[PDB]
Design a protein around this ligand. Structure first.
Ligand SMILES: Cc1cccnc1O
Ligand SMILES: Cc1cccnc1O
Ligand SMILES: Cc1cccnc1O
Lengths: 281, 281, 281
């Protein structure tokens, strides 16, 4: 199933009939960082498997729902259970849910992820406001837009220089200052590692030389689809570890340690994003 | 359809029956840089869709013809409407037209493209004679030669150290000097970005550190297929912008601006390549 | 055919019925470096084409056998005829033979390859004990583990920081010292170039800047599958040339020259690996 105008329209039609919500904001939340979705008011949960043309996710299993409702008086749509390219989903499967968001009325997309720290100033538990990226899959002929262009959504050759909205970064930082946690908030450049293996010690050393501040396995595909169709983006990484220090000390990373950092910061991130949603222009 | 000896032979047979031209030179021209094709003498236009085993191009649409005839007393074959890998064409679809050129008798391939400038000496409107490349798709398991080797055309493991003929570069520069436009002509290393998004500001900064002079989304696949089967290559980039300066000044690039640079230099490039064709050893 | 638990089990069942050997050690040998396989004692040769669920290799042709028997009193299984990703084999085809080794009882995998030298200390004929890697395909969305995770074999997100066992490196060096050829033995970081074109002169210059000591077209996929399922690895590169010196002197590389270096070092490598097998803890 191609992520074209007709197929996205069929999915949006189903959603509109079932939910009655016309959302202005979309959210995609990282692993262990989804508690806000359970607090959406007057909400409606729609399993992906019920929506025409949504990608099949039963090989991976686990949760996969679209959730619509209100937060802070604002109408939102959330993806609960993200699709990642290391699972084998195609370009067309990643793009269709974002293009459905566009047809539903979404103008701003807020995204969180877990990532590894490269810059020496980053510690476990820090947040990074993403200001740009290095897209190794895109340089290497695996960009999410490889294929025919869907002209109704955007241009053949997008410019990504303003993909990460500067005013949204400034609002996120302002709110951190108001609540006295700005000491945890940095800005930086995100490297996309296709995955699913964590960056090796020598890959980490290379990324330091190349100007990367953080590295992870998600987010860049969604950012590119959103920028192509005119949706503004705020993307925030939660830092699980510093991969450069770990290489110098021969210390390992694993999914258990990552999820423990997520649990440590989940409630603060929930409060922060609730306020961002409330304050969006 | 595999780009093998039998399938390439069937296409060449059709072409020979229809055109009567036995070409020694092939040309592939960049977007907005194809006016020379409309001036081929005693010419024959063959739509791709009519040629056995040529790749299907109707999803992308737009022009797609093989044009044969004479320029400067020399017999040539041109591709009008290039196939680019960001459109989703496979390795086999890119390679078949170049291998048909080989069977028709082509010994020299001349290629032009539009590209972004990385080296600080490059301005919009400059030309770069390509002397080597950095093939991000090839390092990342998307080389145009991934697949079984077609032994009739070339070896399993090609050496690319002489892919860009030095004497052809020297002839191109000599002709620029004769016509007093050598101040526009540089040499440099070309980075292949799979595309279709333009290099991001932070990707541009990385490429500067890695020794890249220019970056674009084409050319390297065709060069590799030509080198594999013993065809000599001259490749020239027309510079649309300097991506490093644009990053320092927060200035955007887009296809409209690219095509305007192409229109500004089209007539000079046409005159230059006509003389190169005439003077080839 | 997916490299899952059921399919790997069917292949292992066939092998066990035919060979009667329960191996503790697996070996994968580079081109021209397979003489040790012909000296396995009380051996059994099983063509890949006869084993249920093994990948089809008839397009490439050439040899493809699993060989079981004894070396130095130890039970081993060897792959004779390696599968390389530049031939077009999928992730699932590369992984299945390694996962069969795991089900047969393999705890240690020994691997050899031919590679290009980047570090200025490396000459043709030198050996490099691999201590880490830079996986360009993995960064670029072509990691061997892209796809659903096979949970019976290992975790969704592997850590590769200890993929190259330190004690096995130390044993290999100890044996070189005992036989007075330690002057040929170095350690280093291996860059994976998907291939099949040799690294270009400008790619070589880039790899020097990025901290790479050697570059080749194999090994990293097998290492990752082995690490995922808990098999310890020793990987050794035989250096065919120094690509940085060749770029400075405009000298070419080719498969003939590579195979001549293999023939020059084959007997010494055979003796070294026989002793390593005998001495493994
Ligand atoms: C998610 C993650 C955590 C730590 C390091 N690297 C990553 O990709
Ligand atoms: C064609 C092009 C123009 C300007 C920058 N980058 C590119 O790839
Ligand atoms: C196998 C090989 C030999 C020399 C240089 N590069 C390579 O990949």
């Amino acid at each position: 199933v191609v992520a074209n105008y007709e197929n996205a329209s069929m999915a949006a039609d189903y959603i509109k009939r079932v939910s009655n919500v016309l959302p202005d904001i979309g959210i995609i939340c990282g692993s262990g960082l989804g508690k806000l979705i359970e607090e959406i008011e007057e909400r409606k949960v729609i399993p992906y498997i019920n929506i025409p043309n949504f990608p099949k996710t039963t090989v991976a299993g686990h949760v996969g729902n679209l959730v619509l409702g209100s937060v802070g008086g604002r109408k939102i749509v959330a993806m609960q259970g993200r699709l990642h390219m290391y699972e084998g989903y195609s370009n067309q499967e990643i793009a269709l849910p974002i293009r459905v968001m566009k047809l539903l009325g979404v103008r701003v997309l807020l995204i969180t992820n877990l990532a590894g720290g490269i810059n020496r100033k980053l510690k476990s538990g820090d947040f990074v406001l993403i200001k740009g990226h290095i897209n190794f899959p895109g340089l290497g002929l695996n960009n999410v837009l490889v294929g025919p262009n869907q002209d109704e959504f955007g241009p053949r050759f997008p410019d990504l220089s303003n993909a990460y909205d500067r005013l949204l970064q400034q609002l996120a930082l302002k709110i951190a200052q108001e609540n006295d946690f700005q000491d945890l908030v940095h800005e930086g450049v995100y490297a996309f590692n296709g995955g699913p293996t964590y960056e090796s010690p020598d890959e980490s050393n290379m990324l330091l030389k190349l100007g990367c501040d953080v590295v992870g396995m998600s987010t860049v595909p969604e950012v590119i689809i959103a920028c192509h169709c005119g949706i503004k983006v705020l993307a925030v990484s939660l830092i699980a570890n510093n991969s450069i220090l770990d290489a110098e000390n021969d210390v390992s990373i694993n999914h258990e340690k990552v999820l423990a950092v997520a649990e440590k910061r989940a409630d603060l991130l929930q409060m922060w994003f609730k306020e961002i949603i409330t304050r969006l222009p």
